[PDB]
Amino acid sequence: LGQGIRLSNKRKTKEVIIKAEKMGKYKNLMREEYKNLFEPLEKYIQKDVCF
Amino acid sequence: AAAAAAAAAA
């Protein structure tokens, strides 16, 4: 998949790095575009990788 | 004003 996504506040202080494995943990926490692209690919998704 | 170099340490 790749490097993954990062979480931030409006504070620009704390950032939380996510692995490509743990995307499906945060789920809807990502922006609606990320969710719309992500949800269909959960069918073919594996732990680190997409088939 | 066509005047570029200016300042000289001298």
Partner: protein, 65 residues
Amino acid sequence: YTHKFLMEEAWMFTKISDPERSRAGEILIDFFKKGNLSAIRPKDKPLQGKYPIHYKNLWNQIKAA
């Protein structure tokens, strides 16, 4: 203006170069400072500045260095 330097409005300071003095090119400003360059200082209140006091302090650190 996206260029890293200013073109049209940029200003020049002329110095007749010595081969052994200017060969360094780092010392070029050290020999420049023995001229009139060292005296120039900006006022605390800038025109159109975003971060005036920071830049002014840094300028003084350059002149002192």
